[PDB]
From Swiss-Prot:
One of its GO terms (cellular component) is chromosome, telomeric region. ATP binds at residues 10-18, 33, 78-80, 83, 126-129, 142. The modification Phosphotyrosine is found at residues 15, 19. It comes from Homo sapiens. This is Cyclin-dependent kinase 2. Pfam families: Pkinase. GO terms for biological process: cell division; cellular response to nitric oxide; cellular senescence; centriole replication; centrosome duplication; chromatin remodeling; DNA repair; DNA replication. Phosphorylated at Thr-155 by CDK7 in a CAK complex. Phosphorylation at Thr-155 promotes kinase activity, whereas phosphorylation at Tyr-15 by WEE1 reduces slightly kinase activity. Phosphorylated on Thr-14 and Tyr-15 during S and G2 phases before being dephosphorylated by CDC25A. Nitrosylated after treatment with nitric oxide (DETA-NO). It catalyses: L-seryl-[protein] + ATP = O-phospho-L-seryl-[protein] + ADP + H(+); L-threonyl-[protein] + ATP = O-phospho-L-threonyl-[protein] + ADP + H(+). Coiled coil: none annotated.
Amino acid sequence: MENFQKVEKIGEGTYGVVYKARNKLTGEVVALKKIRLTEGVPSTAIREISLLKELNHPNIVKLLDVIHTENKLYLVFEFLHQDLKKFMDASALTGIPLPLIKSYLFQLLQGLAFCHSHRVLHRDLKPQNLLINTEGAIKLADFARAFGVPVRTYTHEVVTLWYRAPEILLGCKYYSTAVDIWSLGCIFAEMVTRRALFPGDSEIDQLFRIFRTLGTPDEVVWPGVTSMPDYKPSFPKWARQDFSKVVPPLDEDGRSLLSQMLHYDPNKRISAKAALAHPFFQDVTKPVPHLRL
Ligand SMILES: C=CCNc1nc(N)c(C(=O)c2ccccn2)s1
C-alpha cells in the first residue's frame, strides 16, 4: 500500500493476495491482505468484518485493521512465522510428534470454541490458514460469511476441497459450527498420517472419497440426508471402512475423538467445547516445535 513497504508475497488466500509488509510508520511487521472487488463494494462486509477486529483470543490471528481507502479493501493481520502446511511438509520424514499434534489440536479447538461461542464460523479451515509461531502456539486465520464465497481467487487459483464438510458438498445452504469441526478432524488425521485424508480433485470426487472411507450415508446415520439439494439416489453404496485402517497409529482415544469429529450428521458431530473435555486431552502439554525460518 502506501503506509507499507511490501517485503515479500506470502501467497494467495481465497479473496486476494497476502503480503508480508513492514509498516513504514510503526515499523511493525504484518500480513497484509488485498481483497478482490467491476461492481459495487459490499456495505455489510466492511461492517461485519470490522466486527471481527473485536475477536481476541490466543488461538485466533488478530485482525489489526480493515482499511477501505481509495475504494480498495485491505485487511491487516498480526504476522505469524509459518503455516501448518509448510510445517507438515517440513516434518514429512519424521512426522510431527504426537505431543505436538495433540497440543495443536487442543489449541485449535479452543480457538474454534471461542469463535463459535461468539457466533463466528470459519467455513474454510485448512493447513494454509493455520499459523504457528516459535513458542508452540497455533492460531486460526483467514476466516467467509461477511463476503460470500468466491468461485475462484482474483486470478484463477485452485481452491482446495479436501477439508470441506459433507453437508456443504451436498449443497446445504446453511452452515453450522459443525463445518469447522469436520475440517479440523481432517487436518488432525492429516498431521497423524502425514497424508491428506480426503484429497478430492473435484466436488464429486471429494464426496465419493469421503463415502468410500466412511461409507455412503443413508437415512439411518444421517436423517434428512436423502433430501439434501445435491443428493442423488444414484450415489454408489460404499460400506464404511474399519476406522483402524484410517488413522494408524493414532491411539484409541484419538480415533474415538476423530470419529466424533467426522460424524456425517452435523448435529451428531462433537462441538469444540465438548471435544476439549475428551479424554484424548488428558495428558495434553505444550511442546515447542523445531521451526526452520
Ligand atoms: C505463511 C506464513 C507467513 N505469515 C503469515 N501471517 C499471517 N497472519 C498469515 C495469514 O493470515 C494468511 C492467511 C491465509 C493465507 C495466507 N496467509 S500468513
